[PDB]
Symmetry: C3
Subunit: 205 residues, 3 copies
């Protein structure tokens, strides 16, 4: 199983250092306990260590769009606990695992999923899930080992979250539908509230 | 070409040893001549050699969800004639080919298909086909070598089988829509009859 | 950026040597400045060098369905300037780059795209785009380096071209909807006119 209370990952792509603390505090306040900042965000090497230090003991804090082994090294030193990727790159996964970090790497096919498992991944991100649909994951779950947690990422909304959870997703990574670069802290708190609400109702249902 | 009379693969995921002979006898009686038991089925190393021995000379008998080279070795000894996979793993394919077994490995992209061909695959499984659609295969067939048999697997029904065959599939692997773990032998005979009927009408049309 | 005026690739699959010059002249006359002949076209080693010689200084001329390193070598000698593929094969890409040819290789997942970039690809073909949709590319563009040109190929029409361009595609490769083996030169001029018109209106809009 995913080892954090609520299985939702807040993905804050394009957030800047001066806004990182407020937006992360918003998502955590609303119920999130996993947050990551993509490495294609401006000055991520300022924002990430800041959020680790403010929130590292309140939420699973980490990074996304992690494409090179050497980034894993840098992120470990920053106190990153979580590595999310758009792709399967075996040494990235192996290296992150080697630090005792939680890795949720991104695959899109059966072949790619089993490569990620062989690299030591304990969870999988299906990215982008929107093109494939809930049924894709349901089909993947019929071949994946039972204890592998699958996360839908890509076009997941508070409205459709239910269908991902029904299909067999342990949870979801939420990007643009939760945070787009330059939206208000109030919008972040609104969307994060919506997703937490949608998740809780989904389990109930 | 596929070298079995009717190009449909019966996939009996989660079948138990005590039910294997009856359900396989049902599908074969209805017209199937390829059957496989996924290795994520309980006690598959009891069911598979049993079905090889009862039916090996009446149908192409084998295994699915074959993920490790060492499983191919074990299955060869059991008298498996057919290896089906959800993914492309070159040594699995090479090893199975090396035994003179029929391999139908699972790919989802052009890149993965050409890797499987280079490993010696003579047929391809597109898995899961449902997310992609008939048109996906039609598009893949415009680049694949002409004599490669393509099998749709994933969300194929007796109702939509026609559209897969029209799109260029040589045949289909049928899983949950044919057999779900714990359904009656009578249900297996019903669904297998439906698929054989749908296939025959599809060629006619 | 793509370094040719209009970012549309004419793909003439199955064209024969005796028709190559007329059909290529049609597409170029209509506004195309990239054209390729797939290597699964009959007698491509006659058609390609012919079109390089007639049109090489009027358009980006090259080949598609390039699957083996040794084909790249042969095509270089023929004066091919452009290599298009259905799949990601690192040495094909590296070899073509090594000749100073423009490579637009085909990928379908994030993992495959980053492999192609690491092989030196400066542009990407998403193939087949039709199964995935415009939103797939939009999602891929959120992780790809900003300056990588993405081309939709597979089920692109003059009617839907707009939506690919809106989604973030720098352009498109047009196959069966532009040229099918055995259609008239007049049909090629008609479809090529339609695509150029659709593209120009798309930028305008
Ligand atoms: C994984 C990719 C993911 O973060 C993208 O932003 C797509 O998700 P949305 O469509 O924005 O929800 C990664 O960055 O590691
Ligand atoms: C291939 C995968 C296949 O067997 C799955 O069960 C999906 O098919 P259905 O959706 O059940 O029809 C393999 O096991 O090798
Ligand atoms: C890339 C594949 C492409 O050329 C195929 O023909 C699919 O495109 P259409 O559906 O025909 O538009 C390659 O050949 O390198």
């Amino acid at each position: 199983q995913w080892q954090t209370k609520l299985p939702l990952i807040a993905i804050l792509r394009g957030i800047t250092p001066d806004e990182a603390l407020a937006h992360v505090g918003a998502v955590i306040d609303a119920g999130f306990d996993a947050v990551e900042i993509p490495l294609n965000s401006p000055q991520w090497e300022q924002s990430i260590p800041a959020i680790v230090d403010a929130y590292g003991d309140k939420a699973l804090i980490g990074a996304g769009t992690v494409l090179k082994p050497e980034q894993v090294d840098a992120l470990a030193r920053m106190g990153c606990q979580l590595i999310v990727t758009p792709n399967i790159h075996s040494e990235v996964i192996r290296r992150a695992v080697g630090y005792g970090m939680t890795v949720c790497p991104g695959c899109a096919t059966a072949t790619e999923a089993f490569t990620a498992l062989e690299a030591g991944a304990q969870a999988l991100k299906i990215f982008p899930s929107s093109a494939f649909g809930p049924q894709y994951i349901k089909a993947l779950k019929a071949v994946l080992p039972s204890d592998i947690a699958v996360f839908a990422v890509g076009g997941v909304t508070p409205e459709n979250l239910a269908q991902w959870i029904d299909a067999g997703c342990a949870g979801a990574g939420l990007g643009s539908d939760l945070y787009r670069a330059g939206q208000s802290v109030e919008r972040t708190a609104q969307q994060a509230a919506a997703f937490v609400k949608a998740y809780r109702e989904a389990v109930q249902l």
